[PDB]
Amino acid sequence: HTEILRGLRFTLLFVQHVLEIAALKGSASEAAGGPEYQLQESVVADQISLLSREWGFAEQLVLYLKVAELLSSGLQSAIDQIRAGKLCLSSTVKQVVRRLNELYKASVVSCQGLSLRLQRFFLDKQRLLDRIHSITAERLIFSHAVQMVQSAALDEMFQHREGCVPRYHKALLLLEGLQHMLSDQADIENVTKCKLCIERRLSAL
Amino acid sequence: HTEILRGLRFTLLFVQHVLEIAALKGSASEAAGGPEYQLQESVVADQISLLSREWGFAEQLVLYLKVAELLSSGLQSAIDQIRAGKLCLSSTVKQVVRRLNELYKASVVSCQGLSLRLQRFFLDKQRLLDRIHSITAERLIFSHAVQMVQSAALDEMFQHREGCVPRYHKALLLLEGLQHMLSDQADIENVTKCKLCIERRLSAL
Amino acid sequence: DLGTFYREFQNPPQLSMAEDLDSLPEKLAVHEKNVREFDAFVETL
Amino acid sequence: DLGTFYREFQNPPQLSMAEDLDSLPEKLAVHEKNVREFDAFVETL
Amino acid sequence: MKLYVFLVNTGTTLTFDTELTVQTVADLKHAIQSKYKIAIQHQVLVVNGGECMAADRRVCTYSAGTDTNPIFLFNKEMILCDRPPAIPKTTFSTENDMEIKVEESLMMPAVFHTVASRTQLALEMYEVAKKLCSFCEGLVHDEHLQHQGWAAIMANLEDCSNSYQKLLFKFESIYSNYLQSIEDIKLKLTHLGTAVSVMAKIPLLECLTRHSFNVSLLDWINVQDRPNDVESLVRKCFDSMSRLDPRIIRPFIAECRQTIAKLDNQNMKAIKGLEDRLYALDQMIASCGRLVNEQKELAQGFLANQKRAENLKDASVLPDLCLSHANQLMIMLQNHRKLLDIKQKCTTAKQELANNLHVRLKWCCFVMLHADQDGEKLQALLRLVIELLERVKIVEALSTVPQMYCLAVVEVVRRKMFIKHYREWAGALVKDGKRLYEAEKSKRESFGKLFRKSFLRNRLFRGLDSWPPSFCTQKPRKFDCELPDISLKDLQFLQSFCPSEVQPFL
Amino acid sequence: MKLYVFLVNTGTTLTFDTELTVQTVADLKHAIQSKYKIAIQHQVLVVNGGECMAADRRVCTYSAGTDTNPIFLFNKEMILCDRPPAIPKTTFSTENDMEIKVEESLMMPAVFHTVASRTQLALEMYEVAKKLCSFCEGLVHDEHLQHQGWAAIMANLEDCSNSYQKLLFKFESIYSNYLQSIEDIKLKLTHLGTAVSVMAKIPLLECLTRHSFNVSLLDWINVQDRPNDVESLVRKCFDSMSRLDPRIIRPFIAECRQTIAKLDNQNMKAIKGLEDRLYALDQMIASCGRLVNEQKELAQGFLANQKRAENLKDASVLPDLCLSHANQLMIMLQNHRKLLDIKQKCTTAKQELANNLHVRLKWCCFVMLHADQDGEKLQALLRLVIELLERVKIVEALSTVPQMYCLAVVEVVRRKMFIKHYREWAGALVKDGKRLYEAEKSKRESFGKLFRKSFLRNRLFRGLDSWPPSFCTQKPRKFDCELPDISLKDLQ
């Protein structure tokens, strides 16, 4: 037990959480208002975050692609070892690993189905689509998730709402896990600060 | 030093000679000289010479001023004079200088009249002379000494052996007053050296 | 307690997208094939 | 020598003027008045 | 010189070594560790005037404190709750034991030496109580530094109260932030149509995007950075608007009121009143020491007993006088009984003051918790307001940009075209000037060779001696030379095809 | 070391300190003047190919006055003259007058001086005879060195004739160009007055202001120099024409002008028949030396004759006290004078031949003096003729007045007019340009200064980031570019 497949399942839960953040990004973000707020956002914020926001949806589809690829990459090692059998083989994480693999299949399907029109989308100002230089599909909605966590914690430290450290962990600790994706990089430790905050906040949770 | 003796009593003769050096003594390049000279163009040469008939006359007036300025005081001193030269009776030696001195009034007269008559024309010359640098035209004495040595050395051949040696001796005698006009620090000494060369030529003449 | 850090966590640190996007289809189909192999192993599993 | 004389000089050339010596009429009249002593000259001396 | 802290919050004044004269405040907390948990996380350690410093500071970076100067700690890290250490010193029943010893053990008076020893032993007890009194004086200084720390904390509070007023400024800003929010929504409402204008971005441009289609270069650059949100960031804007709801001000206002109450400080001043009396208590204790010195004189008097015990050569009265001296010293020790009595009484009152101070420090830290937590929270709200301003500003900026950058481009295009026109005109005039300059130079050369053949013209000619200024003849450069690319003209044409903000761009 | 070689010019020996190289050639004249009466102007001799030397500095620079330099020059101390002596030999006649064994024994028994005789007095006589022979050898050598000097003199004469040829080539011009000058100077004398009149016709008021008022321009030209005449060039040209009379055109006006043609050339230069006779003289000397070397000994063989007499030891040696026993030595006792005279014959012959050589040297020195210091007059005269050609050229500069003044006036006027018009138009155009600069560019600059942060970044609204070039908007300079104070109207 506690094998490469198990680590892959943990990182796969993290990937699923990040993919859920992405799913909200897929023209589906909502329920961020919480307490009584500037309800006028009904049209204003709607247009602001929807009317021309397909860049985020594309970032989310590419993120789904990245998730499927990462699942395949972890599998090519873990399953190879399991067939080789260097581990204990005392547990049944294999069916769950298969479920994660099917999830990767679905995620890749989503990425391709999106790409069907995202080809012409990227064709719109393709040179502009280029010159991104630094980029990270995770960060694309990680900024949004961190902003949402910030709103929750603004409600929290002033007690305008209640929740748990895990509420932010769903993305911050998601980044904490699978840290190789944030290990040895320019923006390394992508959620280290939120993780440090959640460490203390665990008690209040 | 014979100021009250013969060495200066005869100096009136040298003064008169220097006066003559210009008086009816306007030199020019149109001078023929030598054994002979072609007169086929002598008319135009004299024309070029006399195209400034009064200009040389004015230069002569300026030169004569150099002796006339002292001649005025000599006339002033013609009364109550003191001398002690010997070998004379009834101040005959005094008369030796005073007879020549008796023409000092006419000397001033000529030093004026060599340019005075055409006063209106002299105004234009003065109009020229106003910003024209002055020139003590008496410097032509050095030119006379140079021309004397030059004749004595390089006149056309077949002349006699004496060779106008007395003329160059008189030129050498310029030191008796030809340097009364204005020049540089030692231009008078330079003219005296020219006189020395002319005297050497006279000895050779 | 957590507010001391909440001060620090204000804004998130930052990080040729068209070219990478164009080149992606190879890695995508590669993921598809690795998934097929994974399905093979799972059926074996 | 005559050659030495020409060596000393073969043929060297001749070398605010309205007021540099304009005082001429002054001494001129001075002499015109002074000539009276010689004009008289009752006895030579 | 440098010295250790008073351990003020409880009060355990002590000195330190020479190293601390320049050892940093970090080294200060190190010394705090050196004999205690005093390195722990804590409320504040402070000097006269109130330091509440931090480890980074060098020794001189903070104000001085010494075995005669004020610097100490007043924080929960020692005794987070009331923790009155009791009387370390010995009780005085030995004197009560000595009371018996004088009362009865002075028996067998014929042993004058032993009686004197008892008196000396009584004198021993005297000096002992003297030490006790000194310790009392220590307690006095303890109360001193105690009030000192109380004041230091007070200072902190005022600094917090200063921070409180800073939060108040925020509040005025927050209300202004509430007030400015009145049109900020309209500003966001306008930002809706502004992002609409960003849509249908300049269909062409100088060099299109120039690499630094439906991907609006407006919205594109609106994605030109990693972690921010385009089109006024309204998902965050309404969120912060909630983060600054009137209810927050009300909870914030209540926090402010409590902070004012957190400074009520009624106990502190009232304790001082007692301390003022307790200061007079110190005076009385000083008097106690005075009587102690009196007891010393008694020992000085008692010394005379052992003295006269030797070589007197007189009657038995001297032996009797010691018994009389014994009674005298006994009454002395009775006064001393009252003395040590009031002494320990003072010690008790001292502990009591310490306890009142314990309650004090409790409430003080509570504010230093309740307020200070709320205080930093207010600081956060302040930065949040700064954001509520700056982000809205940027939103309005991009809004104008929907007009601004477009009109700027149109102006640049028209200027570039007319600049080409004017550059052509200026160059043509420059070419004509070069032609005339060549004419002048030709006159110069011709009539100068002629002048080289003129008649002594140096004084005899002028005017054409040179030529008029041919300088500034090389043709001009391009007006608006380095301009962004000409497809801006195509953008100007395309303005109609993207008429979302047509008038302003025109 | 000093030169054992003697002075050829005098054909005699002398001496001086070897460090004389620093002494000047004129200092060399002073040295040869303290005695022998040289002078700073003593002879027509020159250095090298007929020219003067740099005598002022150390004569070593001109290779004169050196330790290896005995006296040699035109040899003016005597006009082909000297005092050639001959060998005195009466001393030998005294020896011949007493040519016998001495009377110190006076016909005593022959044991008297049986190991001594008159050989030494005979030896003294013969050795002195050989001494006179070598003396004649040296004297002949002296005459030969004199011949070498005479050759050097003929060479100097050739160099002089070369200088003469150069001066004649000048004279060719100083004839042909002088003949060409027969027209130029006359015209230079001709039109100069007309030019001076034309110049004085319009003396500019600018010229009146020039020295900073009317004045005579030609005189202003004339008096421009103190000695210059408004027809000085014309006067000098006419004077040169006067000096260009036919007697100057004579083929030997300077008698040298044909003396060099005839004597120093044209088969009259006898130097062609010079050197070989000097060689013939050296041959005569060598033959004399061949005859006279070791000859006194050849006659007086005392060394062997001593033993010869010893072997003789005549039992009747009475007649042997006379020349009969002393044979050829006794012959030498009277022949020494004859040999001395024979040597003196060739010696004085050499001296007289040198006199004849110096005579022909003076014969050429005739045409020499005709050239040196006589035709050199014509030489400087031709230099003057060249100066006269330059004066004619200057006369043309006077002729340059008639068109030069009008050209200067017209060109300056038109140039000032064009300059004024162009500067005014340039200022006006620069003004219109600055007006455009304001109206469009400065307004745009203000709008852009406002446009600070109009977009979140500079490139976002990139465009018209600056104004046009704005060059050429400043004012032009001053018309006519600060000409001289001559006013064109004052010229007008």
Residue numbers in the entry:
A (entry chain D), B (entry chain C): 840 to 1044
C (entry chain F), D (entry chain E): 462 to 476, 487 to 516
E (entry chain B): 1 to 212, 304 to 597
F (entry chain A): 1 to 212, 304 to 583
Paper text:
The unc-51-like kinase protein kinase complex (ULK1C) and the class III phosphatidylinositol (PI) 3-kinase complex I (PI3KC3-C1) are the most upstream and central players in the initiation of macroautophagy. FIP200 is the central scaffolding subunit of the ULK1 complex (ULK1C), which also contains the ULK1 (or ULK2) kinase itself, ATG13, and ATG101. PI3KC3-C1 contains one copy each of the lipid kinase VPS34, the pseudokinase VPS15, and the regulatory subunits BECN1 and ATG14. The two complexes coassemble through extensive contacts between the FIP200 scaffold subunit of ULK1C and the VPS15 pseudokinase subunit of PI3KC3-C1.
ULK1C and PI3KC3-C1 were mixed and visualized by cryo-EM ([Fig figs6]). The presence of the ULK1^MIT^-ATG13^MIM^ heterodimer was confirmed on both of the FIP200 shoulders, demonstrating that the stoichiometry of the ULK1 complex is altered by the presence of PI3KC3-C1. The presence of PI3KC3-C1 induces a rearrangement of ULK1C from a FIP200:ATG13:ULK1 2:1:1 to a 2:2:2 stoichiometry by dislocating an ATG13 loop (ATG13^MR^) from an inhibitory site on the dimeric FIP200 scaffold. This suggests a mechanism for the initiation of autophagy through PI3KC3-C1-induced dimerization of ULK1 as bound to FIP200, followed by an activating trans-autophosphorylation of ULK1. The presence of an excess of 2:2:2 ULK1C cores relative to ULK1C: PI3KC3-C1 supercomplexes suggests that PI3KC3-C1 acts as an exchange factor to promote the 2:2:2 complex, serving to displace ATG13 from the autoinhibitory site #2. This model suggests that PI3KC3-C1 does not need to remain tightly bound in a supercomplex to ULK1C following activation, but PI3KC3-C1 would be susceptible to phosphorylation by ULK1 ^.
